Structures are given as C-alpha cells and as structure tokens.
C-alpha cells in the first residue's frame, strides 16, 4: 500500500524519524517530539537498544538481528529499520519497505524514498536489522492534530484590526478600477468632442482619486506591519514562556543552537500567518470582480487572458522542485567548502612547516570547481524559468492587442474600450501571480509550525507530580535513600540501589573520584530528575509528595561550574527573591567574605557585569554563587570545592560561615580530596555507583580499607 | 526471523546519528 | 581645512584607524594594513605603546600623557587620539578633532563624526592623551593607491565576453525601440482604414520581433553569468593563493573568521565589476538613445519626464541615509537580543534551582520590546519612501496623458504618437532608475574592495629574505645561537640573548616548565619569525642566506598538539611529497609502528578519516605525525612527547627507533618530564628565557642546582 | 604642555577595542 516517510526537524533526530515513519506505516501518528523523548536520543545519536525499547513498549513486537550478508529470504516481516554509515563519515538509519527482483527500497529520512541495488547497497551498510511487527496489545491511533488551528487562537482576539485591513482594502480597489478607466474617457469624450473645459475637470477628479488611493494604501499597510508585530511576538513570546517549565531531560537531550532556531522559526509563521490570511481574503475577491468586470467588457480575450494564467501556473508548478533540489545541493557543498578552508587556515603551521601549500591550494580549487559547476547549473535554472515567463507574459501582451484590434475592427469594441481593458489587466492578472507565488510559503510554513508546535504540546514540569502541600509545612527531618536506582538515558545506570540516610543538623561530606555520579546525587536531591526505582525520604515523607516550588525555593545548590549572569550585582545576587534589603544582603557579604573585593569596583551601587569578562574571577564567581545559596537561608546546603584560587585560605572563612550560621542545617560538600573532611561528622565514599562504607574518618581508617588507601595517596 | 541474533552490546555500541 | 574620518574595517581595530585618520589630515595616506602591522594589533585590543612606538617610527613627536579632568587649556595642539569607555564591556579608541564654545568633535572610528557637550563627554571617556605632532622628519606623501584598477586587469582579457554582452545588449534595446510602435502603427493606420491582411502581417511581424528580442536577452544573460563566474573565481583562487604564502605574524595577529569572510567580500564586489560597469557602458547610452527619440517626438512632455526623474533622484537620496541609520541599529539590537538569550538557554541549571523564570522571562519581554520598536521605526521610513516613490509615479503618468490631450486637441501631435510615447517611456525611465538606485552598491562596493586589496598590497614571506643556496645545499653542520632576542611584537621579550651550542649527530633534549619556552626557540630555529638581535648559525653560515624551501624541507618538526586533515592515510602521511614508493612508507611504519593500528581498519591505507581524525586518540595521532616526521628523512629532527597517554608502552618503541636512525642526523627532543632524558646526552633547561646551566644529566646532578631539585620532586 | 606624564607600563596597560 502508501508508503511513508517523515523528514528531519533537526539533524539529531535520525533515529526516531524511522520509528515514526514505521508507525505511520500502520496507522500510528505521534507527535515526534513525544517519540524522542520516549526512544530518549541523545546529542550524540540513537542506540538500537533505545528503538528497541519504545517500540516494545509501542506494541511492535521488535527484534534485534544481526544482518549477514545475505538478507534476501522471504521469511521476516517488511518493512524494517537498518542502519547505515553514510560515505564512511557518520552512523545513520534508514528503513528498507520492498525487497524483490533485486532491488532494494529505502525511505530514508534525509531525502525522499530511494531505490539501490544490491551490490551497491550491500557495500554501504554494515549488518544489522530490527524486526517490528503490531502484534497484541496494539491499536491504531492518532494523538496529533493541525497546529495552525492552535495558532489562530492568537489572531482571535486580534480581529478588530483585521477588518480595518480588509475594509479598507476593498475601498482600494473600489477606487483603483475606477482610476484605469480615464484612457477611456479621453479616447471617447476628449478627442473627439475637444471639451476643454471638461478636460480640466476630469484631470483634477482622476488626481484627487489617485491621491486618495495612495492616503489609503498608506493606511492599510500602517495596519498591516502593526498586525504582524503583534502576532510575531505573541508566538515568539509564548513559546518562549514555555520553555522554561519543562524538565531537565528535554535540555540535555539537545542542544542551545535547535532551540534558539526555534525563534526564527516563529518569525517564520507571522509572514505565513499574514500573507495567507490576507491574500486568501482579499485577492480571491479582487479577481473575482476583474473577471466579472472584464467578461462584461469581452468574453473571448477573457479566455485568452486565462490560458495565460494557465500556462503561467504551469510553469510555476513545473520549475518549484528542482529550484529547491538545486538549492539544496548548494547549501551542501558550500559548508563542505568552508570545512576545508576553515581546516587549512588552522593548519597552516603544519602546511608551511612541511612546505605543502601546492596540495591545499589544488584540492581547494577542486571544491571552488565544485560549488561554482552547482552554482551555474541552479542559475541556468533561473534563466530557463525568467526566459519561459517572459515568452508567455509579452506574447499574451501582442495577442491582447492583436485581438481588440480584431474585435474593434468587426464593430464589437471601441478603442478607449481597448485601452481601459488593457489597463485594468492588471488588477485581475497580479492577485492570481500572488495566489500562486503563495503556494511554497504554505508549505515551508506547515513544516515550520508543526516543528515549533512539538515542543508546545510537550508536559511541562509541573503537571506531572502529584501534590500534598498543606499537610507539611517545614522540610525538617531525615533525609534517607531507600533502594534508590538511576540511569541518566540509554546509557548504561550510572548510579545502583543505594541505601543512605542523613540524621538531622548535621555537617555531611561525599568522597568520589573518577565521575561516578558524585554530583549526581545532588540533582537528583533537588529533584531535577525522578528515580524510576526507590525514593527518598524527609521527615518520613516521599520528595515526591511536596510540593516542588517550595522545594526549589528552600534547597541551595552551588554549580561546579559556577555561572553568572550580565547585569549588576545588586541584582544579580539577589535573583530569585525580589524585595530585599541590603542590610541581609550585606551581612551575607560579611560573612561569605565578599565585600572585600567590592571596594576595588567603580560604583558599589552599580557595578555593571559582563558575560565572560576579564576583570571576573571564577573563585569570585563561587564567591558570588555561595552569597547567594547563604542568602537563601535555608536548612539545606550542598557545596562543591574551588579546586583553586587559594583553597587552602578560602577554607578557613569556609568553616567561618557554616560554624558560624549558628543553627542546626544540613549542609553537603562534594569534593575529592581528604583533608577538609577530616572534622566532617559523617562523610560519605561513592565508587563506581555504590558506596563502600559509612562513617566518619576514625573509623574508616581503622577499617583498612580502599580509603587508606587513598588517604595514603593523598600523603 | 530466521536472521543470526545480535546481543545487547552491540546494540548499546551501535551509535546510530 | 575639511575634517576626514577612516572606517574601521574589523571590530578589534580601534588603535589603527584612528592613527591613519590622523595621518590623512596631516597628508600621508598610507594602506591601514601596513599601520596595522607596525601597530602590532592583537586578536584582544591595541596597546597603546604600540601606538606611541609606531607614530615615533613614523616622524611623528608622540607624548603620552594621562588626561586631567580639567581639559580647557589651549596648550596642546589639536587633534589628539584618546580612549573612550563607551561601555563596561569595551574599551575604544577615538580622536578629538577642536574645541569650540564648549562643544566637542570626536571621530569615532565606528560612528563618522559626532558632537558633544562637556556634561555627557567628560562621563564616557578615561584619562588618556597621546600627543602626535610632526617632527621635521614627517613628510607629506601618498602611498595609497585606486585599488579598482587593479582589479580590472582580471577584466581586461576577457575582451571577448565583454564586447559580445555589449553588442547583444545594444541589439536588445534596438530591438525594444523597433517594437515599441506598435500602438501607434495600430492606431494610425490599421484601425482608421481596416486592412485586415496588413493587420495578421504586421502582428506576425512584431511577434517574431519580440521573440528574437527574448532570444537576444537569453544569449546575453548566460554570458553575464558565465562572465561573473570566472571572475568571481579567479578573484577568489587570486587571493587566497596570496594569503597563503605569508609570515605566520599575521596568522597570530588576526582570527580565522576575519581570514575567511574575505571570499565573501570577493563575491560582493565581483557584481559591483561586471554589473555597475555593463549599465555604465550600455544604460547611459541607450538612455541617450531615448533622450533624443522623445526630444523629436515632443518636447514638453521630455520635460515632464525629465521632472519626473529629477524628483524621483531627489527622493532617493534624501532618504538613502537614515534607511542605512535603522538598518544598523536594528542589527546590533537583533545581535544584543541573541547573545543575551543564549546566555539564558546556558544557565538553565541556575534559572531553574532559585526560582526566577520570571526575571529572565520579563527582561527578554522588554528586549524583544525593543527590537521591534527599532524594526518599526525603519518601518515607517521605508513606507514613507515606497508612499513618496508611488505618489510621484502616478501624478507623471496623469500628467503626461493631460499634456498629451492638451497637444493633440491644439493640434500639435496625433492621437497615436501620445501612446506610443507611453510606451516608450520604459527605455528612457528604467535604465535611468538603475543608474540612481546603483550608487549604494558603489560606495559599499569600493570599501570591499579595499579591504579585500590591502592585504594583496603586502609583501610576502618569500621575498623578506636574501639567500645564497648555491653555495651550500646541506643542513649538516652545527648549531649555535649567540646573543639573540626575539620578540612576538611590541609585548615584553620572551627570550633573552643567550649563548647555545648543538653538536653535529648528537642527541640533546631541552626541559621548559612553568610557563617558560620550549616551543618559541623552536620555531625561531626554523625561521618561522625573524630574529631582531644576533643570528643563528649553521656549518659556520647564517641560516637566513639559504633558501627557505630546502630548510623547512630539512627540518622535521612535531608540534605540542597535533593536526590531522580530513582525507585518507595514504596521502596524509606522504603530505607534501608525492613520487613516493610504498616500500619506504612501509619502513617507516616499522619505526613509527603505527602497523599495529592498520590491520583492524577496513581499509589498510585507504581507509578515510571521518573529520580531522576524529575518530583516533591523541596518542595515535602523535605516532602518525612522528611517521610523517621521519618520510621526510630529514637532518633534523624536533619532538615533544605526548604528555600523559604515552603510558611507557610507546615510549620504549619511540627510543628504539630513534636509537635506529642510524645515521649522524641532529635530534631535538622537548618534554616536560625528566623521566626518559637520562639517555639523552646533553639537557638544557630553560628558566624565565634563560638557559642558566648546560651539561649532562649526572654533572647537574652533582652540581646539587634546581635541576635536582626539580628531578627530586619528579622522583 | 600640560597633563602628568605616563610612564611606559601604563601605557602598555592603556587596551582599546
Ligand atoms: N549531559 C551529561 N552531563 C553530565 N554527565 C552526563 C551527561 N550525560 C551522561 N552523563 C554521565 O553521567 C554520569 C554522572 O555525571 P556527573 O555530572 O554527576 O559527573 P561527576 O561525578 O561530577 O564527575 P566529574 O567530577 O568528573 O565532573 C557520568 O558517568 C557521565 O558520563
Ligand atoms: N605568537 C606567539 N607564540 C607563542 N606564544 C605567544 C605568542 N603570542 C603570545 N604568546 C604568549 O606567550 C606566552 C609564552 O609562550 P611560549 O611559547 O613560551 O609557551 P610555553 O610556555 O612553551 O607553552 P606550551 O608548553 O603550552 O607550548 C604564552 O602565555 C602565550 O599566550
Ligand atoms: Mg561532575
Ligand atoms: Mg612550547
């Protein structure tokens, strides 16, 4: 039957777009972002075992196989995803739908559905198969809809302004077919009959009725650019708005660059919205009354004038793809150009060292061969299409012509008839040019709202715990791991089933090397992530339970990678919480040992910060960050070590701060060297997903085990 | 489904992307 | 005398256009890239003792002097360059023309020439003057030249196209004149005395007129392009050939960005050579052509037209100016939005963990704010114009029917000239807006090309040198550095005048740590940067009187991180020297061992590596370069073991082999370790760019000097 | 001439953009 394949929304995204392309092959439409997140790709690429696993929680009874060279039995299920290594550069994955009369069928996601052979196509892809097939438990169902629909929700209470566009705009025309029909007038009243004085008259009447079509003009397209501003921040605003709820998964799985894309991709859909929205209402309605308007003037060169449009459409049509496949190769070979240059510009030591500027220079010249071989044939494209356009809009032109001065000469039309005619041509042969040139702008416009709107219809963060809010008002209690289990994706589980518990007050430290998840615990604390097995439990009560707002807003957390933001201090400090003194804020200075490095800055009132400036510091960045987790002041502290900038001496005000914030808080450190820890109460050691042993340093030392070892590394 | 069976860490090694 | 302002070219140079703005107000136009050069601009900003140093090489009495805050004294003499902070997050450069009535003139390099007030000037700008004042040893002069003509003499053979696009282009219009009069034969004679059989003919006639005449522009049209093509590529090929060939000095200087973007500046001006100078040689000629076709046709109704396009002209440059104004503004706020918002999207972990998603979501709402604020207010200019450009083509287009009736019925012309002349119009008018609305792409055009052709103005690497190869074709002999200093620019010497010996076929290793050189000394051996003071010495000769190409082909050298290119092992061993037998390249990997690694690739030395090696590990990208180091057989031989990956498992291999050359070639070995340097025969370690102590390992030993020390602390 | 003098590492230190 129909064959399916869906397209790239970005370039990650191989793998689930096979999926979808399989589930749509059986009646199973998704949302690709709710399949992305299901199959959990990642920036790298996609594991067959993540395919595996959505599509056996789909319903596809899927299998694993490893291909042999032979593949060609009548015996397993078509059509099946395969993976490729396309010109030996990257993985990929397509999917094979018709295997017959040695000729193999490919939808493969980056282009349309393709045809190989067998020696070819057997060269090329190394093994490797999965088998799906909608056995039980299996239904066909489509959770997807139109986003357009969603987006007109936007012009909606907009609508107001829309009718003075289009009120306006047919007072326009109502007074332009009036202003063609002066070549008439003058034909017919003027040189035959000499009447000067009505010559007179009617050159001011047509002025003024020109002057008026410009006031008017001038006013509908005031209203037009306020129109579009309006609706384009409308989207980019709400999408953003949206954005920030949502977990952390949807943030690690890609990356900043396909969600500042987003953005013009809304920008996008306000020149789509716009253009579409007028010219279907306004444009459709202008040709209608031409051609009424001309079939009363002539019948005959009524049809002449639409076989023009015809063949213009058709030329339109003809010419819209490979335009498009040409562009496309262009876009290719010029990156694939300036990787070489960008390559050889960097080298350039090892090329002027080894005396080899003759082989960069030849092989860059080749590329340059390349680009401008593809840029000349897409501009022989051009010309083609200019050349087909101008033979049909100069010879319908003569014809026009050739046949009014036919009709005038039987006795069925008059000259001024004639020359009218000829003017208002316009008003009935540019809407329909403007209807057809509208066509691609739909189709870029529907893929782009469709990409933008997979991430609308996503779960935000908050929808998807379950609260108790009222019953507990204080986070005071035990903190406690029980049979805690975690993977980050696809990956392999980093952290096992652990069993760890946090007595109440008390100064805790964890000991890890080699990243076995060691700040992991701390994310999963400040509840970023949800562990599918086990819990953790506070004052006897599941982190799941309570409320998330109050949550974030009472845990502190320190990044080991510290990030400021630009703006100024006074600001920044306090980000989060507005409604602040200085009198707490400067305690918290004091006592964080951050003022002493404010007198050196311009205006203590307005000290202006940069991203990434020369003057910061990444010690007076962490600085900065535990200032603000003590102005937080919550119960609930982790921390993670300077590893530079004098630790040995930040150490002392250090202990300052937490022996000195004189109550009974739970503060977490994070570090990799012993000799802080030593005072710790309890300290915590984490290898490779499980820890060893609780306790304190006395004890473990007496143990003799792996961390005398390390504490004999250390010294 | 007569093809030879491929173990998990090959599908965890096969990077596809 | 007029006040004369240079644009600065890249963003990091401030400190250049303001010293050659003053050097054009004192006469000596001199290219920006050879005062760039003297300057020693960085990648970061301009030291202003480079400023002070370049304008005393010059002629010019340079003084330096910390501006007071009191800046009324009419004792120093005008103008003076100074720094303005115009923000926290840049420093800038400008010159202060005079004062007058307590109003300032500044000439920002950025931004022409703008007028301030002592209330809001004193605010920006930092204590700074510098004193520039001709010497007696200035000279006005003129080293600057029309850069344009040279980049004709790539035209100039091309005589064939270019007069064949002329003659095509003439027979065009000639063409378009002889169909222009249909309207009036139609209505002069075949309406009035009804000749049905010269009607058919004589629209036959036109018809095939026409066609010949879109044949003609077809013709025309694929030789422009193909014209445009090979120019833009040789212009292309042209400069990158050149840039190539230069010392590394401006490599350092310059990033690789402002290094590429030239190949787009290369395509902006090739459309401004053909296409400005084919409408200037066809265009204004066949707009003659019209001039005097409608002067015998009518004369009055000429000076209709002529005022039309009088008006037209002025509308167009009165407004050409403030649309530029908006454009710029619009992008640097369109740049500040996005940077601002991917600082958003980075520190999501900090947006998220305090809880201000409203802080960042309100900032970025009254950003957007004012990008579409900006974006309407270009907006309205741009609608103000497209208003102005219509209001003045529609009153012509009545005004010249009312002309023409007036005419006709005072008996002057005939009905059918009146038509004819309409019809005629679009010769005399539209070649005339081309050549208004082309003045932009000029005056854009020629600040291309001049920063395109300043760097092709500067000498290159080769001929810096004077050499005397015939003499001595052989690197063999001994190395001696004696009193020599060299500097990267104008900062603080790395190395100091030294003393040091190589002997000939003799291993020596150089130890450099804690910052000091070990890469600077090498690259000053391999006359990568001309030595200042003293020289260095082979075979008692100087290296600089040999020829460059047999040096660098002598010399093998391994940087401290490595550089793969994309292609294939096969030719990226053999980079630089082809005619190579396999049979040595095998040899070669016996020594460089790199054969373990061949067998379990696909391909033996076929196989392509994915993007710069991505796939290897650093490790094995040292060993192949060290193959790459020993193809060229060379007399000598510089490494820098790998720092950690080594693992003592190649290490004994690299030994081996270099105990295998066998033969008296000169080693140089650079690490940061003691470890394998015991075998080495004589060590010399490098302290703050000294050589304090030269001998073997066992007499610093018992010298007891900081080299044991430094051996202690390793072991 | 009027203005304090500036020594050479001042100068050094005196960065545009
Ligand atoms: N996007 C990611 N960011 C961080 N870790 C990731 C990511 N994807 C997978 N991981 C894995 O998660 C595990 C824990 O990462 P985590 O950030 O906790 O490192 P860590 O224990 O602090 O290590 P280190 O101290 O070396 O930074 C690691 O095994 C890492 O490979
Ligand atoms: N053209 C240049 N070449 C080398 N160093 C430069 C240059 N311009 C500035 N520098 C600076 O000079 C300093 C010393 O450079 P040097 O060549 O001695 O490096 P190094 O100490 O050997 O370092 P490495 O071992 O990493 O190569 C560095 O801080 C570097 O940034
Ligand atoms: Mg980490
Ligand atoms: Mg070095």
């Given at each position: 039957?129909?064959?399916?394949?869906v397209?790239?929304?970005?370039?990650?995204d191989?793998?689930?777009?096979?999926?979808?392309?399989?589930?749509?092959?059986?009646?199973?439409?998704?949302?690709?972002?709710?399949?992305?997140?299901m199959t959990?790709?990642?920036?790298?690429?996609?594991?067959?075992?993540?395919l595996?696993?959505?599509?056996?929680?789909?319903?596809?009874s899927?299998?694993?196989?490893?291909?042999?060279?032979?593949?060609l039995?009548?015996?397993?299920?078509?059509p099946?995803?395969?993976?490729?290594?396309?010109?030996?550069?990257?993985?990929?994955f397509?999917?094979?739908?018709?295997?017959?009369?040695?000729?193999?069928?490919?939808?493969?996601?980056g282009?349309?559905?393709?045809?190989?052979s067998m020696?070819?196509?057997?060269?090329?892809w190394?093994?490797?198969?999965?088998l799906?097939?909608?056995?039980?438990?299996?239904?066909?169902?489509?959770?997807?809809?139109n986003?357009?629909?969603?987006?007109?929700?936007?012009?909606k209470?907009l609508?107001?302004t829309?009718?003075?566009?289009?009120?306006?705009?047919?007072l326009?025309?109502?007074?332009?077919?009036?202003?063609?029909?002066?070549?008439?007038?003058?034909?017919?009243?003027?040189?035959?009959?000499?009447?000067?004085?009505?010559?007179?008259?009617?050159?001011?009447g047509?002025?003024?009725?020109?002057?008026?079509?410009?006031?008017?003009?001038?006013?509908?397209?005031?209203?037009?650019?306020?129109?579009?501003?309006?609706?384009?921040?409308?989207?980019?605003?709400?999408?953003?708005?949206?954005?920030?709820?949502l977990?952390?998964?949807?943030?690690?799985?890609?990356?900043?660059?396909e969600i500042?894309?987003?953005?013009?991709?809304?920008?996008?859909?306000?020149?789509?919205?716009?253009?579409?929205?007028?010219?279907?209402?306004?444009?459709?309605?202008?040709?209608?009354?031409?051609?009424?308007?001309?079939?009363?003037?002539?019948?005959?060169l009524?049809?002449?004038?639409?076989?023009?449009?015809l063949?213009?459409?058709?030329?339109?049509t003809?010419?819209?793809?490979?335009?498009?496949?040409?562009?496309?190769?262009?876009?290719?070979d010029?990156?694939?150009?300036?990787?070489?240059?960008?390559?050889?510009?960097?080298?350039?030591?090892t090329?002027?060292?080894?005396?080899?500027?003759?082989?960069?220079?030849?092989?860059?010249?080749?590329?340059?061969?390349?680009?401008?071989?593809?840029?000349?044939?897409?501009?022989?494209?051009?010309?083609?299409?200019?050349?087909?356009?101008?033979?049909?809009?100069?010879?319908?032109?003569?014809?026009?012509?050739?046949?009014?001065?036919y009709?005038?000469?039987?006795?069925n039309?008059?000259?001024?008839?004639?020359?009218?005619?000829?003017?208002?041509?316009?008003?009935?042969?540019?809407p329909?040019?403007?209807?057809?040139?509208?066509?691609?702008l739909?189709?870029?416009?529907?893929v782009?709202?469709?990409?933008?709107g997979?991430?609308?219809?996503?779960?935000?963060?908050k929808?998807?715990?379950?609260d108790?809010?009222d019953?507990?008002?204080?986070?005071?209690?035990?903190?406690?791991?029980?049979?805690?289990?975690?993977?980050?994706?696809?990956?392999?589980?980093?952290?096992?089933?652990?069993?760890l518990?946090?007595?109440?007050?008390?100064t805790?430290?964890?000991?890890?090397?080699?990243?076995?998840?060691?700040t992991?615990?701390?994310?999963?604390?400040?509840?970023?992530?949800?562990?599918?097995?086990?819990?953790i439990?506070?004052?006897?009560?599941?982190?799941?339970?309570?409320?998330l707002?109050?949550?974030?807003?009472?845990?502190?957390?320190?990044?080991?990678?510290?990030?400021?933001?630009?703006?100024?201090?006074?600001?920044?400090?306090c980000?989060?919480?507005?409604?602040?003194?200085?009198?707490?804020?400067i305690?918290?200075?004091?006592?964080?040992?951050?003022?002493?490095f404010?007198?050196?800055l311009?205006?203590?009132?307005?000290?202006?910060?940069?991203?990434?400036?020369?003057n910061?510091?990444?010690?007076?960045?962490?600085?900065?960050?535990?200032?603000?987790?003590?102005?937080?002041?919550?119960?609930?502290?982790?921390?993670?070590?300077?590893t530079?900038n004098?630790?040995?001496?930040?150490?002392?005000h250090?202990?300052?701060?937490?022996?000195?914030?004189?109550?009974?808080?739970?503060?977490?450190?994070?570090?990799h060297?012993?000799?802080?820890?030593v005072?710790?109460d309890?300290?915590?050691?984490?290898k490779?997903?499980?820890?060893?042993?609780?306790g304190?340093?006395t004890?473990?030392?007496?143990?003799?085990?792996?961390?005398?070892?390390?504490?004999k590394?250390?010294? | 489904?007569?093809?030879?069976?491929?173990?998990?860490?090959?599908?965890?090694?096969?990077?596809?992307?």
């Amino acid at each position: 039957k129909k064959y399916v394949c869906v397209r790239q929304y970005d370039l990650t995204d191989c793998g689930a777009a096979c999926l979808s392309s399989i589930a749509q092959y059986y009646g199973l439409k998704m949302s690709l972002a709710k399949i992305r997140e299901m199959t959990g790709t990642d920036t790298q690429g996609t594991n067959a075992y993540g395919l595996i696993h959505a599509a056996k929680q789909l319903g596809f009874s899927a299998k694993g196989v490893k291909a042999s060279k032979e593949d060609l039995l009548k015996d397993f299920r078509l059509p099946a995803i395969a993976n490729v290594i396309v010109d030996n550069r990257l993985a990929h994955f397509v999917v094979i739908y018709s295997i017959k009369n040695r000729i193999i069928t490919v939808a493969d996601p980056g282009k349309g559905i393709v045809r190989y052979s067998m020696d070819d196509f057997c060269s090329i892809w190394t093994g490797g198969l999965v088998l799906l097939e909608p056995g039980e438990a299996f239904q066909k169902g489509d959770y997807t809809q139109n986003m357009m629909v969603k987006f007109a929700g936007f012009l909606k209470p907009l609508k107001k302004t829309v009718l003075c566009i289009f009120l306006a705009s047919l007072l326009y025309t109502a007074l332009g077919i009036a202003g063609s029909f002066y070549i008439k007038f003058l034909f017919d009243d003027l040189i035959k009959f000499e009447k000067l004085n009505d010559l007179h008259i009617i050159s001011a009447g047509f002025a003024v009725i020109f002057l008026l079509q410009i006031f008017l003009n001038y006013y509908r397209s005031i209203l037009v650019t306020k129109l579009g501003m309006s609706i384009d921040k409308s989207i980019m605003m709400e999408y953003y708005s949206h954005v920030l709820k949502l977990p952390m998964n949807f943030f690690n799985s890609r990356k900043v660059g396909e969600i500042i894309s987003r953005f013009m991709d809304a920008s996008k859909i306000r020149q789509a919205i716009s253009g579409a929205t007028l010219t279907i209402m306004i444009d459709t309605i202008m040709a209608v009354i031409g051609g009424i308007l001309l079939y009363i003037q002539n019948s005959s060169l009524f049809f002449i004038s639409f076989i023009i449009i015809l063949l213009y459409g058709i030329i339109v049509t003809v010419f819209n793809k490979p335009i498009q496949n040409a562009n496309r190769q262009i876009m290719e070979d010029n990156a694939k150009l300036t990787s070489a240059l960008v390559e050889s510009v960097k080298g350039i030591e090892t090329i002027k060292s080894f005396g080899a500027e003759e082989q960069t220079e030849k092989s860059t010249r080749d590329k340059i061969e390349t680009v401008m071989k593809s840029s000349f044939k897409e501009g022989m494209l051009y010309i083609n299409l200019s050349s087909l356009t101008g033979i049909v809009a100069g010879l319908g032109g003569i014809v026009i012509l050739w046949a009014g001065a036919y009709n005038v000469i039987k006795g069925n039309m008059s000259g001024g008839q004639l020359l009218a005619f000829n003017a208002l041509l316009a008003y009935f042969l540019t809407p329909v040019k403007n209807l057809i040139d509208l066509q691609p702008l739909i189709q870029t416009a529907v893929v782009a709202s469709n990409r933008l709107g997979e991430i609308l219809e996503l779960a935000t963060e908050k929808e998807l715990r379950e609260d108790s809010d009222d019953f507990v008002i204080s986070l005071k209690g035990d903190i406690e791991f029980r049979n805690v289990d975690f993977r980050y994706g696809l990956r392999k589980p980093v952290l096992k089933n652990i069993n760890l518990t946090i007595p109440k007050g008390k100064t805790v430290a964890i000991v890890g090397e080699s990243g076995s998840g060691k700040t992991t615990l701390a994310k999963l604390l400040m509840n970023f992530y949800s562990p599918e097995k086990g819990d953790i439990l506070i004052n006897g009560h599941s982190i799941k339970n309570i409320s998330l707002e109050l949550i974030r807003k009472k845990i502190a957390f320190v990044s080991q990678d510290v990030f400021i933001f630009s703006g100024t201090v006074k600001e920044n400090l306090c980000l989060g919480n507005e409604n602040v003194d200085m009198d707490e804020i400067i305690k918290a200075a004091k006592m964080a040992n951050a003022h002493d490095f404010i007198e050196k800055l311009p205006l203590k009132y307005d000290t202006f910060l940069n991203e990434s400036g020369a003057n910061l510091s990444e010690g007076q960045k962490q600085r900065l960050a535990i200032a603000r987790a003590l102005l937080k002041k919550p119960d609930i502290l982790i921390l993670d070590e300077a590893t530079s900038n004098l630790d040995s001496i930040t150490e002392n005000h250090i202990k300052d701060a937490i022996y000195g914030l004189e109550d009974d808080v739970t503060v977490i450190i994070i570090a990799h060297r012993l000799s802080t820890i030593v005072n710790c109460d309890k300290i915590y050691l984490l290898k490779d997903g499980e820890i060893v042993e609780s306790g304190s340093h006395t004890e473990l030392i007496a143990l003799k085990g792996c961390y005398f070892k390390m504490w004999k590394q250390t010294e | 489904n007569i093809g030879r069976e491929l173990t998990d860490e090959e599908l965890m090694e096969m990077t596809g992307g």
